Design a binder for this molecule. Sequence first.
Ligand code: HEM
Ligand code: HEM
Ligand SMILES: Cc1cc(N)nc2cc(-c3cccc(CN)c3)c(F)cc12
Ligand SMILES: Cc1cc(N)nc2cc(-c3cccc(CN)c3)c(F)cc12
Ligand SMILES: C[C@H](O)[C@H](O)[C@H]1CNc2nc(N)[nH]c(=O)c2N1
Ligand SMILES: C[C@H](O)[C@H](O)[C@H]1CNc2nc(N)[nH]c(=O)c2N1
Ligand SMILES: [Zn+2]
Lengths: 419, 413
Amino acid sequence: RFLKVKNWETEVVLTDTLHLKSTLETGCTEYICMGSIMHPSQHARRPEDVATKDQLFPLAKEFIDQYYSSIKRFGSKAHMERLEEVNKEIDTTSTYQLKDTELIYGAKHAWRNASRCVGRIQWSKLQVFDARDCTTAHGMFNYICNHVKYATNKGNLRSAITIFPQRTDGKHDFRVWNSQLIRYAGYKQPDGSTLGDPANVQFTEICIQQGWKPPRGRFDVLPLLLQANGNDPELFQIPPELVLEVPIRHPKFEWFKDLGLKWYGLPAVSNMLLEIGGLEFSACPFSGWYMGTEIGVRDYCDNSRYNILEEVAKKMNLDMRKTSSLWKDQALVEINIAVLYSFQSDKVTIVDHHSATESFIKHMENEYRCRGGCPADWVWIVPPMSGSITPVFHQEMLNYRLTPSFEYQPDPWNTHVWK
Amino acid sequence: RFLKVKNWETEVVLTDTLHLKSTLETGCTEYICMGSIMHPSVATKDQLFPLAKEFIDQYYSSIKRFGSKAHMERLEEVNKEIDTTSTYQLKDTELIYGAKHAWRNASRCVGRIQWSKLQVFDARDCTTAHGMFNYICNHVKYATNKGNLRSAITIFPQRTDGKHDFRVWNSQLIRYAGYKQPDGSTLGDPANVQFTEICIQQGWKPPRGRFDVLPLLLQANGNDPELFQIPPELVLEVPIRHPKFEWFKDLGLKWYGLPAVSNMLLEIGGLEFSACPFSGWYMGTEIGVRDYCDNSRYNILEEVAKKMNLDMRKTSSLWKDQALVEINIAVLYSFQSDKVTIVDHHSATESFIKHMENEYRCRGGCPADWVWIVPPMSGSITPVFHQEMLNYRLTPSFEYQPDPWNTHVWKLV
Ligand code: HEM
Ligand code: HEM
Ligand SMILES: Cc1cc(N)nc2cc(-c3cccc(CN)c3)c(F)cc12
Ligand SMILES: Cc1cc(N)nc2cc(-c3cccc(CN)c3)c(F)cc12
Ligand SMILES: C[C@H](O)[C@H](O)[C@H]1CNc2nc(N)[nH]c(=O)c2N1
Ligand SMILES: C[C@H](O)[C@H](O)[C@H]1CNc2nc(N)[nH]c(=O)c2N1
Ligand SMILES: [Zn+2]
């Protein structure tokens, strides 16, 4: 059945047929909505490790069919032969291998399918680095360094994904143990408080426990912790010259630069899993450019993060006596003004939440026009500040799960059998 | 079957068993989620007993009287009525309980920590629009309480055959008129333009100004609705000024103190109360963010940013964001100075989190609509933003109904 979505600010209605292709459960039922659960479902597509032939082949035949349908070649010579080819590979190795073209289509369509991503207007501009030949942590580190250098591009950032060998039996997983390629360290204090970034206290302590000598500051770039083919992970320090960083100053308040804050320029998620025709790529660092709110709202102001609202209000001469002065809201805007101004001053790519949300509505129209729909997750698309004065707030959205996709995966130290 | 929700700021984990009690659809399916759709998707005898049995069993359970003599008698008494009359009548106790639980069950409402203190006015003896006006006037006075606002609902007879419905045509009991101009602009509140037209056509002579309190349009027993002017002295209003910007008062802005929604439908035990205006007090952002800053509303963001000298050339200045905060400060300060009840979005979200935990503890869950609970500004810095929530439809519930002018078949001339 068709389904309609409406924008209550413009009354534009869109009709969704794409959802008929959705594959995995969302977690919801007709009696219960789970649209604010972080991980609602666990509906995978095969047993975690090596499926049987009748379990893996259907998923592959699905993806190949879709890819050749994409390129106006359904049922053609290449398509029929490829099916037989994947049959014989599965028969002989219990898995199969993607062509380079199929790998790129797959990567680009996982992004296009990422319902939580406000940035997807860019989806077809992704640069894919094939690292499926990699065999060691050292090689993993080389591929990552090149990723970082390409994607940073001196501040004119470029979207990229690097794809390491697919999972095979689960014992031989490639993993980036860091959650992002570049994050700051968090240090548990003697008095019980925390220095650096609290999100990373546990990882930061794994690194120290692994032999990292922490400089023990507020903005200590963490080492890379890389796992190849199921071995114990290994530490690597990213060459500093490759880590672009922006000092936060404020266009008006000169005292702001004296708060001593900076953030890195490149967001690069490295703990997610990419899924293409039954194949699972457990290591696939991908990177873009920040929306300003990701730094200034969440990274700086969350309570279990940097928590600098506290101080920015003091230096602003604000009534911190009661909430109704809205001192939190007022500092929160100034901080985000500063992040945007600092990144733009240093000609480092960044997008504000007004431009980004506007782009996503344009993207949404585009998709409904040519594709029959566009999975979008209102809870994540709406920026965490000034929600209702952005155009996505008044936009109805359908959420559903298309493949290929990015998926979550457990932290490798919960499941790693050490050597 | 249990179900868990996590707070990702505090790691508190609550366990929802109450969700098994729902039997109303959400519009979500197993493979699509519709949690951001505004509106997803009369009874015969056969349909009615089970709904009534459901509510009566629930009521006698709530008072530790389940299976009692008085419980079984009420059930049989209810059955008799649905046979003899095709409907039935709620007791006064049942009505109060139902009214309060509909509030308790309203998943989009962040102010439900107050649910048990609802003052219920039984207006089921009403027969005419003039009767309705009297009841509403006494609702407004009382709830307003000279600025010390008190929650209250007034409940009118209930639907019978669909033909003799009571309706308040107003969407709230106090709203400002809106006049579209020949040049395309709008005077007053753009949100109420259509209802303003309806009133004018019914005979209302508008002052055609910025803050005209609309007249009540009251329908009783399925008759044509009638106009009535709320007595001006019962409409408490707050002039909006700002504690720092002495120029803010020059915007000439004011709002009414009493938010009082009147277009919804109250469902208790299969009975439909199509007129049931209810009221509480404001969260600031309802006025400061959605009333004055929604582009389709009073839209004073441009004007406020002007008078702040902000750089309005590029969005990344965040002038919009900056002007929004100041309006919302001015709203809270204005109400607190005139000692009219109001809650800011921080305090309100903190209270709802306490309320939710308590309701999991004592009730086994608490249906909540994250898309509506999260304030429309500064979301991530309020605790609900990080709170996982399960959404499902318990009854009694408040429900949406179609606008009366889209379905009313007229009588006069
Ligand atoms: C190019 C600039 C991009 C911007 C501005 C952007 C923006 C965002 C933001 C703000 C979020 C929510 C993050 C949070 O609040 O925690 C998000 C989610 C996400 N983004 Fe993007 N993104 C960009 C590029 C990319 C690329 C290149 C990929 C992968 C190819 C990607 C994949 C994702 C995924 C998979 C999620 C959510 C996954 C989940 O949790 O289920 N993004 N995006
Ligand atoms: C006393 C203080 C109250 C506060 C602070 C409050 C606050 C709110 C807010 C902010 C909303 C969202 C409105 C929007 O942003 O569009 C809401 C929705 C709602 N409130 Fe409350 N409210 C209060 C009292 C009540 C009472 C007394 C009732 C009924 C007896 C009630 C029933 C509802 C309902 C039914 C909805 C959502 C209706 C829908 O599904 O659209 N509220 N409330
Ligand atoms: C590529 C990219 C860019 C950006 N600017 N932001 C991004 C945010 C996420 C993201 C998704 C879910 C959870 C989290 C936080 N762990 C981040 C992500 F995957 C990729 C992002
Ligand atoms: C009683 C009460 C108090 C308050 N403070 N707020 C309330 C807001 C709504 C409401 C529900 C749906 C949409 C809208 C938007 N006009 C408002 C409502 F029914 C009742 C409210
Ligand atoms: C499209 C979207 O679902 C819609 O605008 C909703 C979102 N959340 C909301 N939340 C509140 N409090 N009030 C609203 O009107 C809305 N509107
Ligand atoms: C409980 C809630 O679903 C959770 O905190 C979500 C809400 N929306 C979000 N939205 C974005 N963009 N990023 C997030 O981490 C979250 N967290
Ligand atoms: Zn849902």
